[PDB]
Amino acid sequence: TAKALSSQIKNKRAEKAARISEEEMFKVVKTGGWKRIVTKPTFVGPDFTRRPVKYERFIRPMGLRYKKANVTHPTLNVTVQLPILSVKKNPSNPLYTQLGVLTKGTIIEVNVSDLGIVTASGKIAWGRYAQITNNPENDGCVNAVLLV
Amino acid sequence: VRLLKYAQSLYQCKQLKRAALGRMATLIKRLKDPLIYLDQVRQHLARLPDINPTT
Amino acid sequence: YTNQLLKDICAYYGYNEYLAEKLLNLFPPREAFAFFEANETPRPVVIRTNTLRTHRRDLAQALINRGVTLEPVGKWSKVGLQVFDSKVPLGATPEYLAGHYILQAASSFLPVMALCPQENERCLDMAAAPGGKTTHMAALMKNTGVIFANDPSKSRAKGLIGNIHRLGVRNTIVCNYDAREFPRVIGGFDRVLLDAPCSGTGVICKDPSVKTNRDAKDFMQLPHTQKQLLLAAIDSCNHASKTGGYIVYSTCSVCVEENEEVVNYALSRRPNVKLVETGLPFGKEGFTSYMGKTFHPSLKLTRRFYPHLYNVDGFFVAKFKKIG
Amino acid sequence: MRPLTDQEMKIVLDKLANYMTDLKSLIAPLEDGDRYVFRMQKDRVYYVKLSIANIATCVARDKLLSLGTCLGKMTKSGKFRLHITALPILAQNARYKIWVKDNGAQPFLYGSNIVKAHVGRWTEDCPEHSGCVVYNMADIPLGFGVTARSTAEARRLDPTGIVCFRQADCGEYLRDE
Amino acid sequence: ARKQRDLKKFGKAVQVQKQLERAKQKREALDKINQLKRKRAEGGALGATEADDPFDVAVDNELSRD
Amino acid sequence: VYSEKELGIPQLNTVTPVGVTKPKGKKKGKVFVDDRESMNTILAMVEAEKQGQIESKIMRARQLEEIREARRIEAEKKEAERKALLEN
RNA sequence: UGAAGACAUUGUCAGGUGGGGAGUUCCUUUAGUCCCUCGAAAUUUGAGGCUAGAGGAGAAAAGUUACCACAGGGAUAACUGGCUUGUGGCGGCCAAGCGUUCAUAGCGACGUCGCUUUUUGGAUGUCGGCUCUUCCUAUCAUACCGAAGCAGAAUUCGGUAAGCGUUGGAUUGUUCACCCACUAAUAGGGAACGUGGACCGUCGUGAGACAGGUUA
């Protein structure tokens, strides 16, 4: 039935479809070991943000971010790629939490609208907790277990 | 390539290369059946008579 | 059949059955189908010029030089423009950085256009979450007079103040209050602006949650809250002033429970209110009676905006004048 | 809910006179008789009208957040600061103005210090450490800061050198969003 | 000078207990997350989205209605 | 080299008077100069410090006279307020 | 006694505020009562009251942060050396055995399933460039065979094999990819990666500068 659920979600997505960078910014700032670049994967969200000076010089590289995560649902035994909403708590470092570093066991907020789980009052949920449970620096693909 | 360019350790490169080669291996593993079909069509199209429609 | 159409629409589009029933009641099958196609279709993005800082042709020339494709938004809005494509991001362009313009929707055009602020006037805005409405009142009045802005939340409040200081309003006092509390606390404003929080059925392209994240419980509590909101606004408004002052109600909900019903309730409760022609060129007539519920025939002047008729967000307007 | 005290408004006018000239014009009576009076809430100072303060005092201290235009906040050591929120009055009553180009203003809006190639035209008789207001080509107030050196030394210095110590600019507004 | 002398004579130990605290904190974090998973698998019953409160706060509130 | 404010050095009765001094660490009093005239007095002293050295005796004298007028107006307003408080 | 003139104006209360002045030393989080009040709603909800679970010297300035700049202190002298290669990760199913007492406290390979992943076919900073010797094979060619719808020819894969030889142009900061020209063929590497600034400061602290020096 996992094939059926994945096919339904993918077909819904297909039908719906059918119907400056921080690095160059910091280079310009330098022109106009002082630089630290984060070597761990992160998530930004909005396309352009000018960070407060407390975190301005924490550069994060272009490729290392990941927009979507592979979320596995403990019940119904289905795994689907879903967009990452935001990063909430990285137990390794509060600084990593604030930046958005995606380490092992890190809980983020994930959009589960595609899954369509029904909550109390016969109501649907859009955003839920998911624990990143792999080592994305070891394996670029970012995998989480949903919390239901 | 970007991940390896920003890699920071030997074990980092270890697991990154292993993961990439695993991705290609799994892709071919799913491509298992088209290869058989295309081999069969290749064999017949080779053992196909060649006429000249114009002549 | 009606049930077959309801099931087909729910299955194919993902709408809740109850909201689908309301929308089917609201629009005939052709108009309903057009409405659903429109509201899944993304809306265009418009830009409002800062008349205090620059003017339309200069801003348009600058954005053409920077490679932004622009088109004036109808004859109705002189201050507005519509974006087709932009090589440079709209966020990072020098005009936006200096405050020459803002990004918004035509539904953000319509209500302050209904309002007619004048110089040296006292104005209120109990819901200005993006701040565009307060900024546009400031642009209309040329930074003459006083603006009071009320908000519930610190987050959209700081977004508001960022927008205000970026656009250089210079005469707004920004506060975190209750909208119901505002009249008793201060009251006595020449003009008042209410963008009442609603179900959000108007813009599901912006809020895809409303497609399902709207139950009967919300449909019951929300109109009561906006009822108290209009009670607060009519308490705030001044009956007599040297410059005529009017109440403006704007909402982004299309369901009838949110539209024309609460304003009928306010009109029935307070005789001091009359409704005048809101002054908006394109719109749809307000319904005299919808579900066995008689509404005052004067609601004819009330305008409605639909995505399917016009490439605008689903939007609702009402304008009132106070006697005593 | 207090007006400023002696040393507080002394440091405030110290900064405001280092940056502006006509503080008489700022605190001078108006036609109606209303006056612009300094306010300070939560260790943060604001510029408001006296009538505005009178009509706003009716609110409880905790619930009210902003009033008039924010000028700045005082640090724990007592050092007073003026911000991009106080930029407009500073531009209105600026003593020294320095104008920059677009290619130099863009790093200025980012947060970079002013370079000699950035400025378009110069103010005359500028002291070494005097405060100044940085405009663009369109006379749009971009920021403020303390110059690294005087106009003549800027003339005879290398184009790549730092010109003004970039204090605060439009960055603060979109920082909060 | 007294304070500097104490800091110099302490030295290593400050760092040692710093890492000990930083690992005990992460142990508590993992334990709390495990409690979250256990209680939520056993039961629950939320709204549409996450509670607006940052973490540690939502987790004590959920443990509270436990 | 350490800050005199941090250093617990008592004030000394030199030519400049100590006057009445607050008890240490307990509720330093608050005096408001919210009056526009007091604003002008302190601002004029600030501008005097800003101008500093001048090459004209007449200009120095007129500067001093203006800020003296500032104190005079401030004192007159304070006396008027004291009279009003005595009435009330 | 005249004037402005129903504009101003004053007083009355119902509010709110108040760190300024005086004097002293409850609110926060949760659930219920769905009881009472105020509302809404064609009859059910919303907001208070009530109840009971857990919290708590004062205007001078403070507490606190895996944060910033600065100055300083502390710690490690530095890395790998049977390390390196060709086969991903997450979750489930299955699973011999072992285990706290037994495949269920539980650990647990190979496979399969779901996500990446599907219905019409450019990346690269300093470098290099040439030659020569030697060595390894993880072999481009020459030799040898095993397999393939391998009719022939031309081939592909596999292995035994280091004796043999292993050229250019475009393009580029420059290399490879790709592209094209010869040619049996233009294969990969090793040879201790084989031979030819930082303080003394001075002037600034919302940011820096110095034809200043001590000089290693």
Side-chain angles (χ1 to χ4, degrees):
Chain A
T1 192
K3 261 205 86 165
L5 294 174
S6 68
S7 66
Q8 293 179 356
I9 297 169
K10 291 174 70 175
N11 290 318
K12 293 187 286 185
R13 292 181 181 177
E15 293 179 353
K16 290 176 186 180
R19 64 141 291 291
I20 79 166
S21 55
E22 301 176 2
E23 282 176 306
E24 62 194 357
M25 163 165 291
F26 207 80
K27 297 175 183 178
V28 176
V29 166
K30 285 294 292 182
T31 60
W34 200 72
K35 310 162 168 280
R36 282 82 65 193
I37 186 157
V38 159
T39 53
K40 277 74 68 177
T42 45
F43 181 76
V44 176
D47 299 349
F48 167 59
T49 61
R50 53 161 170 211
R51 209 141 66 258
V53 67
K54 175 165 70 174
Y55 293 100
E56 190 276 331
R57 323 173 319 200
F58 281 122
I59 297 169
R60 60 162 80 63
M62 295 298 102
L64 280 71
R65 324 181 200 71
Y66 300 107
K67 291 174 70 175
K68 311 172 74 179
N70 297 295
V71 179
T72 80
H73 184 198
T75 61
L76 281 75
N77 292 318
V78 65
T79 62
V80 193
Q81 182 181 182
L82 292 144
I84 289 191
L85 294 174
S86 54
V87 184
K88 300 289 94 176
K89 184 158 175 51
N90 189 358
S92 301
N93 189 359
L95 188 153
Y96 287 177
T97 300
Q98 304 222 21
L99 291 175
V101 176
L102 294 174
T103 61
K104 184 212 171 313
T106 300
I107 287 172
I108 62 170
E109 183 178 1
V110 183
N111 188 359
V112 286
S113 69
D114 283 352
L115 294 174
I117 190 167
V118 169
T119 62
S121 305
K123 185 33 191 162
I124 193 166
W126 271 61
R128 291 297 189 93
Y129 309 139
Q131 184 178 2
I132 301 299
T133 194
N134 63 7
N135 280 12
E137 65 183 1
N138 293 342
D139 49 351
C141 67
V142 63
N143 304 358
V145 65
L146 183 63
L147 297 178
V148 171
Chain B
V1 173
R2 311 161 183 73
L3 271 293
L4 288 163
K5 188 174 76 71
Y6 275 93
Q8 261 288 347
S9 80
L10 202 173
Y11 179 45
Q12 273 303 70
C13 297
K14 204 83 161 173
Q15 184 66 41
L16 285 171
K17 204 192 51 63
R18 287 209 87 254
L21 307 202
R23 311 281 289 296
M24 283 137 277
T26 56
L27 290 161
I28 317 304
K29 176 67 70 69
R30 175 197 190 207
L31 294 175
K32 66 182 288 185
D33 291 331
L35 299 175
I36 278 168
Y37 176 96
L38 277 296
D39 200 35
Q40 295 298 109
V41 65
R42 184 221 91 211
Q43 291 200 5
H44 187 13
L45 184 63
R47 64 151 72 100
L48 188 70
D50 186 74
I51 64 170
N52 189 359
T54 66
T55 196
Chain C
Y1 202 42
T2 297
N3 290 318
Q4 204 69 7
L5 294 174
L6 273 175
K7 295 185 290 293
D8 288 8
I9 295 169
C10 294
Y12 192 27
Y13 294 9
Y15 292 96
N16 183 302
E17 293 179 354
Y18 182 75
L19 188 153
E21 293 179 353
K22 292 183 183 293
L23 291 196
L24 183 63
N25 291 352
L26 260 59
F27 314 93
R30 283 82 58 85
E31 211 200 324
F33 182 76
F35 182 76
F36 293 105
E37 276 213 16
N39 64 7
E40 322 163 338
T41 312
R43 284 311 71 91
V45 174
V46 298
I47 291 172
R48 199 252 289 171
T49 316
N50 171 334
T51 61
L52 310 169
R53 288 215 189 287
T54 186
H55 64 279
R56 203 204 210 176
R57 70 183 68 89
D58 207 357
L59 178 65
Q61 271 208 2
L63 306 166
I64 299 299
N65 291 318
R66 269 75 184 276
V68 180
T69 311
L70 299 174
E71 172 171 334
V73 285
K75 294 182 184 293
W76 48 290
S77 181
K78 288 192 170 185
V79 190
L81 291 169
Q82 179 176 350
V83 168
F84 294 120
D85 200 9
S86 172
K87 276 287 183 174
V88 190
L90 282 184
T93 191
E95 293 81 4
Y96 184 46
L97 294 174
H100 282 150
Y101 72 87
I102 190 167
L103 279 76
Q104 78 282 10
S107 284
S108 300
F109 290 167
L110 277 296
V112 186
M113 293 177 70
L115 199 54
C116 287
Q118 315 288 350
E119 302 174 2
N120 289 318
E121 280 196 319
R122 184 185 187 188
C123 301
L124 181 154
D125 194 347
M126 64 184 73
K133 293 182 188 60
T134 45
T135 293
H136 182 254
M137 293 183 286
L140 294 174
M141 66 182 180
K142 301 170 176 174
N143 292 357
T144 55
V146 192
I147 298 297
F148 270 78
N150 187 8
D151 201 81
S153 179
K154 277 74 69 177
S155 58
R156 64 177 64 90
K158 68 181 178 67
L160 188 154
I161 62 170
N163 290 318
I164 301 299
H165 307 77
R166 183 180 63 83
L167 277 299
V169 167
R170 187 210 309 165
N171 74 98
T172 301
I173 304 153
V174 176
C175 81
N176 187 358
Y177 293 167
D178 190 351
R180 282 163 280 165
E181 276 281 345
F182 213 83
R184 188 270 299 164
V185 168
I186 306 169
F189 293 77
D190 298 348
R191 281 178 159 75
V192 288
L193 173 59
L194 173 55
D195 192 347
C198 64
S199 63
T201 43
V203 195
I204 62 170
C205 66
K206 178 186 121 155
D207 198 2
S209 57
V210 176
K211 185 183 286 185
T212 293
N213 287 351
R214 294 294 87 193
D215 67 3
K217 293 180 177 68
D218 300 322
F219 275 75
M220 293 182 286
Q221 286 70 241
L222 291 145
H224 174 68
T225 300
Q226 65 182 357
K227 187 179 290 184
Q228 322 209 353
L229 294 174
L230 293 174
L231 294 174
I234 62 170
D235 186 74
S236 306
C237 200
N238 298 116
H239 55 281
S241 61
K242 300 179 179 178
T243 61
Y246 302 85
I247 312 164
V248 163
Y249 181 76
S250 61
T251 186
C252 296
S253 179
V254 298
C255 52
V256 172
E257 292 191 336
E258 302 278 349
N259 314 137
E260 284 98 10
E261 183 178 1
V262 176
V263 294
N264 187 11
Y265 183 110
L267 183 62
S268 73
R269 284 311 61 81
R270 289 324 314 289
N272 289 318
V273 176
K274 305 206 213 323
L275 61 83
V276 311
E277 171 36 33
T278 182
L280 282 71
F282 50 96
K284 287 319 294 175
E285 213 163 7
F287 312 112
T288 300
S289 293
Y290 186 54
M291 294 298 103
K293 279 186 165 56
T294 70
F295 316 113
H296 190 303
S298 47
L299 292 175
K300 291 174 70 175
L301 311 172
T302 299
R303 301 299 92 193
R304 278 174 164 256
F305 311 83
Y306 297 116
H308 61 87
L309 295 174
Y310 293 99
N311 291 318
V312 298
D313 294 22
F315 182 76
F316 172 86
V317 300
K319 187 175 183 178
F320 314 87
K321 165 163 180 46
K322 188 177 182 186
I323 299 177
Chain D
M1 193 37 86
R2 292 144 39 238
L4 311 185
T5 71
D6 294 291
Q7 303 189 353
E8 293 176 330
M9 61 80 71
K10 291 174 71 175
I11 304 175
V12 167
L13 306 164
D14 268 327
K15 268 297 181 186
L16 295 175
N18 266 1
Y19 282 94
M20 283 74 74
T21 177
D22 268 4
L23 294 174
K24 321 319 161 283
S25 81
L26 294 188
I27 180 61
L30 276 72
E31 168 67 11
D32 190 19
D34 195 16
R35 313 175 290 105
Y36 268 104
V37 179
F38 306 88
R39 179 67 178 87
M40 183 278 288
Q41 177 70 77
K42 270 185 172 178
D43 284 347
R44 195 162 287 199
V45 68
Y46 310 89
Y47 205 67
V48 309
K49 287 181 179 181
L50 178 56
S51 59
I52 289 178
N54 275 341
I55 65 170
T57 194
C58 70
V59 189
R61 181 177 65 196
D62 296 300
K63 199 65 145 40
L64 183 63
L65 291 193
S66 68
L67 194 64
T69 186
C70 174
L71 303 181
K73 87 154 191 182
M74 293 180 183
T75 63
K76 277 175 187 162
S77 62
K79 175 282 171 193
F80 169 64
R81 174 71 90 61
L82 76 167
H83 292 108
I84 194 65
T85 305
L87 172 71
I89 299 174
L90 170 56
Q92 179 62 254
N93 265 340
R95 177 157 38 212
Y96 308 112
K97 318 175 192 278
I98 301 188
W99 292 271
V100 299
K101 305 168 188 176
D102 208 1
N103 54 6
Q106 182 178 201
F108 183 83
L109 305 191
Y110 294 153
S112 297
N113 290 318
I114 297 169
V115 188
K116 170 65 164 49
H118 297 195
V119 298
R121 72 279 192 190
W122 272 105
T123 189
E124 288 195 4
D125 305 324
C126 198
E128 187 180 15
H129 296 308
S130 61
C132 73
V133 185
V134 192
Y135 292 162
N136 77 331
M137 73 291 291
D139 281 320
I140 297 169
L142 302 180
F144 51 89
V146 165
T147 81
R149 75 277 189 188
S150 64
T151 293
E153 275 175 325
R155 280 218 202 203
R156 313 182 74 188
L157 204 76
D158 203 48
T160 60
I162 302 177
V163 175
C164 183
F165 303 127
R166 200 221 75 61
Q167 298 330 125
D169 68 80
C170 61
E172 305 284 15
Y173 308 131
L174 187 150
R175 274 185 173 168
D176 283 331
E177 61 76 20
Chain E
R2 177 65 66 192
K3 296 183 289 294
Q4 296 294 321
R5 258 176 264 142
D6 307 302
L7 294 174
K8 294 181 176 67
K9 73 169 63 63
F10 289 165
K12 280 151 163 44
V14 174
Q15 186 179 2
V16 176
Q17 287 70 241
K18 195 83 209 154
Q19 287 70 240
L20 293 172
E21 182 65 26
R22 283 173 162 178
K24 187 268 183 181
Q25 271 183 6
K26 184 178 184 293
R27 275 192 168 183
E28 285 167 327
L30 294 175
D31 267 16
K32 291 176 70 68
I33 301 299
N34 284 352
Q35 294 179 357
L36 294 174
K37 296 183 289 294
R38 183 176 176 86
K39 65 182 185 188
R40 184 191 281 300
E42 293 179 353
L46 282 152
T49 60
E50 170 180 2
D52 291 331
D53 303 320
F55 291 172
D56 267 355
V57 171
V59 299
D60 305 278
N61 307 293
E62 293 179 353
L63 294 174
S64 73
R65 280 82 66 193
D66 279 5
Chain F
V1 164
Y2 303 92
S3 73
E4 190 276 331
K5 293 180 181 180
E6 269 183 332
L7 294 174
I9 302 300
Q11 297 155 295
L12 294 174
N13 189 359
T14 179
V15 171
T16 63
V18 297
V20 63
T21 61
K22 59 93 179 178
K24 199 269 175 176
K26 289 191 170 182
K27 188 148 185 171
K28 309 175 187 171
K30 261 198 189 307
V31 191
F32 301 142
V33 286
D34 186 74
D35 279 350
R36 169 186 178 271
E37 288 72 23
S38 56
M39 310 274 189
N40 271 338
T41 67
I42 295 171
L43 156 67
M45 293 183 286
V46 168
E47 285 197 349
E49 298 189 9
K50 183 261 303 174
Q51 272 193 341
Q53 303 176 13
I54 306 188
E55 294 177 350
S56 292
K57 291 180 179 174
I58 300 185
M59 293 177 70
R60 301 175 199 152
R62 294 293 180 91
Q63 175 178 158
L64 286 173
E65 285 164 26
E66 295 163 2
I67 321 168
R68 290 166 197 157
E69 178 180 2
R71 279 83 65 192
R72 289 188 292 116
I73 303 305
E74 183 189 353
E76 287 194 4
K77 183 167 183 54
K78 292 208 170 192
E79 264 193 356
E81 290 176 2
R82 287 170 186 175
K83 289 183 182 177
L85 290 168
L86 285 186
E87 296 186 1
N88 292 16

